[PDB]
């Protein structure tokens, strides 16, 4: 209990209390405040009382979390274990195959190299998601029908051997979501979690979302069908492929997620497929082909079903044919989680939108308001003290045009000249990256790091690290996952914050409006209006600004916000300027 830093001592004692009361606590503490110490204290406290403690954390931070939690002597009496279900592991074979015919050389290399971390934990889905953002995880996850000699399969078996029913179960958000959905469908986790601690809860929602996303990928399926039932199964898939195109042109864009009612052209083939794929003999099938037919049938069924929304990728737009089916409402699934939860402490650096307003996060995770509790935030002054906010900005309104691209690249070149070290330059579009890359790369080589669909966020991260260690002054056109969850703190030199130049300049080229393409946020925006478009945008803005200051004691860091609309004095940019007035 005594581990926690002094400033987090109050937020602990409330959160431990209310969770004992049965409330769902929203504990927001900024990055670099020793949150893991608090997590350890709460988990041990609820474990010594004897009721089941489950701490769900992104598996990337599970290492430091166990390193914090085993320093409590009570978590040695009462056992600590790690529930590592197959939802944590991809299929190396299927993932490598998907990487090849989608030309993600980074992902293919990582699989070939052994799936090493970015027993030892390999083939991790979170690492693969660092490597490939749009991974169709549902059809690339380790299943029960995968070969015993498949490396990920046998690593999972080796860990299932070491699993002992214990007091504190450490968990990934994906394991939690998969367990909850499995419980949902009846009518390796405790069927009633008495105490729940969710680190990095801002991601938990997406986890649940991914667990309900079923994807039918027709090319590996057709090649797996390679026997009795060949023409019917292959031609059912062929028809399903040919009907996927009469909505890939009918749609005003390929990207709007339509229900099954809007596009009935897919209804027959689906049915056909579901039976033809089911007609094939399982005696006469290799163990690994069972997985690709099972997952395909499950996706096709979850298409022709009560509550699901669809999207298509076929023909000239997308070389890899793929039908996606996701639920737009996660109310039943998250309420099944919460009804099986006595108390819960949602912990993250970003739970609130302004002050202690947990309303949007409340609605995201479908917490019942009678249980919610918004404890006050904990943001020490050093989150803004070393930072120096500047004024200059690309006067051209960001409209994804060559004029804006050239002028913004001019401004970024100036920043690069004054830059004393690593520079992050966050964009909101692949196109914004393409343009800025082309115009800004004439002046910068061996310094420019351009994020791309081919060049993963992880590859650019490692290139930033290495170009820093050698003495180059690197600029990174960051994108997507660069706003959230890339740690740009120099990992050497921990014992002195000193003058860390790995991230000296952060550069917001554009306000992150509409970066959330999830179905759930689409429903929310439909119901509640533009105000939560703005709330989500300011949420992403907070997270992007959170890249810079990672721990107490840093110096000479510079914030740059190049958006024209922020200084144009309009009304909607008000909550952004409000978080900007907190600087300099």
Cα pseudo-dihedral 111, 117, 119, 123, rounded to 10: -30
Beta-bridge partner residues of 478: 426
Q: Yes or no: say if 192 and 340 are a contact pair by the CB < 8 Å rule.
A: yes
Label residues 229-244 b or e (16+ Cβ within 10 Å = b): beebbeebbebbbebb
Q: Yes or no: say if 31 and 554 are a contact pair by the CB < 8 Å rule.
A: no
For the record, the structure tokens of 384 come out as 């803004």
- Structural element, H or E, at residue 457: helix 457-469
Contacts of 553 (CB under 8 A, 6+ apart): 382, 496, 497
- Identify the three-state secondary structure at position 61: coil
The CA distance from 316 to 323, in Å, is 15
264 CB neighbour count, 10 Å cutoff? 10
Q: Yes or no: say if 157 and 150 are a contact pair by the CB < 8 Å rule.
A: no
DSSP 89: B
Beta-bridge partner residues of 193: 341
The CA distance from 77 to 385, in Å, is 43
The CA distance from 31 to 199, in Å, is 12
Q: Yes or no: say if 451 and 457 are a contact pair by the CB < 8 Å rule.
A: yes
DSSP 249: T
330 CB neighbour count, 10 Å cutoff? 25
SS (H, E, C) 332-383: HHHHHHHHCEEEEEEEECCCCCCCCCCHHHHHHCCCCCCCEEECCCECCHHH
Q: Yes or no: say if 466 and 422 are a contact pair by the CB < 8 Å rule.
A: no
**At which residue do the structure tokens 């070389």 appear?**
319
- Identify the three-state secondary structure at position 213: strand
Q: Yes or no: say if 216 and 322 are a contact pair by the CB < 8 Å rule.
A: yes
Q: Yes or no: say if 314 and 324 are a contact pair by the CB < 8 Å rule.
A: no
The CA distance from 543 to 30, in Å, is 10
The half-sphere exposure of 131 on its side-chain side, counting CA atoms within 13 A, is: 27
SS (H, E, C) 112-149: HCCCCCCCCCCCEHHHHHHHCCCCCHHHCECCCCCCCC
- Identify the three-state secondary structure at position 387: strand
Beta-strand runs (E) in 529-580 = 557-561
- Identify the three-state secondary structure at position 523: helix
Q: Yes or no: say if 82 and 172 are a contact pair by the CB < 8 Å rule.
A: no
Closest by CA position to 69, among listed 58, 79, 84, 83:
79
Contacts of 391 (CB under 8 A, 6+ apart): 567
The CA distance from 407 to 416, in Å, is 14
Q: Would you call 340 exposed, middle or buried from its count of C-beta atoms within 10 A (0-12, 13-18, 19+)? A: middle
Q: What share of the chain is helix, strand, coil (3-state, %, to 5)?
A: 45, 15, 40
For the record, the structure tokens of 142 come out as 């380790």
- Structural element, H or E, at residue 326: strand 322-326
- Identify the three-state secondary structure at position 109: helix
- Identify the three-state secondary structure at position 215: strand
The CA distance from 150 to 291, in Å, is 13
> How many whole angstroms from its chain centre is CA 108?
20
Cα dist. 17→8, 33, 331 in Å? 15, 21, 27
Beta-bridge partner residues of 44: none
Give the chain's radius of gyration (CA, Å). Answer: 24
SS (H, E, C) 476-515: EEECHHHCCCCCCCCCCCCCCCCCCCCCCEEEECCCCCCC
Contacts of 433 (CB under 8 A, 6+ apart): 427, 450, 451, 452, 477, 479
Residues in the chain after which the backbone breaks (C–N beyond 2.5 Å): 118, 187, 226
DSSP 163-205: ----SEEEE-HHHHHHHHHHHHHH----SSEEEEEEETGGGHH
The CA distance from 27 to 377, in Å, is 7
Cα separation of the two ends of the chain = 36
Q: Yes or no: say if 186 and 99 are a contact pair by the CB < 8 Å rule.
A: no
Cα pseudo-dihedral 388, 389, 392, 397, rounded to 10: 150
The CA distance from 322 to 218, in Å, is 6
The CA distance from 369 to 367, in Å, is 6
Resolution (A): 3.0
Pairing mode, if any, of strands 322-326 and 213-217?
A: antiparallel
For 381-581, CATH number out of 3.40.50.300, 3.50.50.60, 3.40.50.1950, 3.40.47.10 equals 3.40.50.300
The CA distance from 223 to 226, in Å, is 5
The CA distance from 504 to 420, in Å, is 7
Contacts of 308 (CB under 8 A, 6+ apart): 214, 259, 260, 302, 325, 326, 327, 328
φ, ψ for residue 326, nearest 5 deg? -130, 150
Cα pseudo-dihedral 366, 370, 376, 378, rounded to 10: -40
């Amino acid at each position: 209990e005594g581990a926690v830093r002094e400033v987090l001592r109050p937020l602990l004692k409330q959160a431990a209390e209310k969770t004992a009361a049965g409330k769902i606590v929203f504990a927001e503490a900024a990055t670099g405040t020793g949150k893991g110490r608090m997590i350890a204290s709460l988990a041990a406290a609820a474990a010594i009382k004897g009721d089941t403690v489950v701490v769900s954390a992104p598996l990337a931070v599970t290492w430091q979390l166990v390193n914090d939690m085993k320093d409590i002597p009570e978590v040695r009496r009462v056992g600590l274990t790690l529930s590592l279900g197959r939802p944590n592991f991809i299929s190396p074979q299927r993932t490598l195959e998907w990487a090849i015919d989608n030309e993600r050389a980074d992902l293919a290399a990582w699989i070939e190299g052994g799936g090493k971390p970015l027993h030892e934990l390999c083939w991790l889905l979170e690492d693969a998601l660092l490597l490939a953002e749009d991974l169709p995880a549902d059809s690339l996850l380790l299943t029960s029908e995968d070969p015993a000699d498949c490396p990920a399969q046998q690593l999972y078996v080796a860990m299932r051997s070491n699993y002992t029913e214990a007091g504190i179960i450490l968990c990934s958000h994906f394991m939690l979501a998969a367990h909850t959905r499995m419980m949902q469908m009846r009518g390796s986790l405790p069927h009633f979690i008495d105490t729940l601690i969710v680190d990095e809860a801002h991601l938990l929602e997406q986890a649940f979302a991914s667990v309900y996303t079923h994807t039918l990928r027709l090319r590996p399926l057709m090649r797996t069908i390679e026997s009795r039932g060949r023409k019917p199964a292959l031609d059912a898939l062929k028809e399903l492929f040919t009907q996927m195109q009469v909505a890939s042109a009918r749609s005003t864009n390929t990207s709007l997620n339509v229900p099954l009612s809007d596009v009935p052209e897919l209804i027959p083939a689906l049915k056909d497929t579901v039976k033809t794929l089911g007609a094939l003999p399982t005696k006469g099938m290799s163990r690994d082909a069972r997985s690709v037919i099972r997952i395909a049938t499950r996706a096709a069924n979850d298409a022709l079903s009560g509550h699901s929304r669809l999207r298509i990728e076929v023909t000239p737009v997308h070389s890899y044919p793929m039908l996606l089916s996701g639920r737009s409402n996660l109310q039943r699934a998250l309420l099944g989680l919460w009804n099986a939860t006595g108390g819960a402490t949602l912990v993250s650096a970003t739970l609130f939108t302004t002050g202690d307003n947990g309303s949007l996060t409340r609605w995201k995770l479908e917490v019942p308001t009678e249980r919610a509790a918004f404890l006050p935030p904990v943001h020490p002054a050093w989150t803004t003290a070393p930072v120096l906010l500047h004024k200059e900005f690309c006067a051209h309104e960001p409209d994804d045009s060559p004029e804006w691209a050239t002028e913004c690249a001019q401004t970024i070149q100036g920043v690069a000249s004054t830059a004393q070290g690593g520079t992050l330059v966050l964009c909101t579009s692949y196109q914004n990256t393409e343009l800025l890359a082309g115009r800004l790369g004439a002046a910068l080589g061996d310094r420019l790091i351009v994020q791309s669909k081919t060049s993963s966020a992880a590859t650019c991260l490692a290139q930033f690290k290495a170009k820093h260690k050698a003495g180059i002054r690197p600029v990174w056109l960051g994108l997507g996952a660069a706003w959230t969850g890339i740690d740009l703190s120099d990992h050497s030199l921990p014992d002195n914050p000193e003058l860390d130049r790995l991230l000296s300049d952060l550069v917001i080229t554009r306000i992150p409006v509409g970066q959330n393409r999830s179905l759930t946020h689409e429903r929310r925006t439909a119901i509640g209006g533009f105000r939560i478009i703005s709330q989500e945008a300011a949420w992403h803005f907070r997270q992007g600004l959170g890249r810079l200051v990672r721990r107490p004691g840093v110096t000479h860091k510079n914030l740059w916000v190049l958006d024209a609309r922020i200084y144009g004095g309009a009304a909607w940019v008000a909550p952004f300027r409000q978080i900007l007035d907190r600087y300099k």
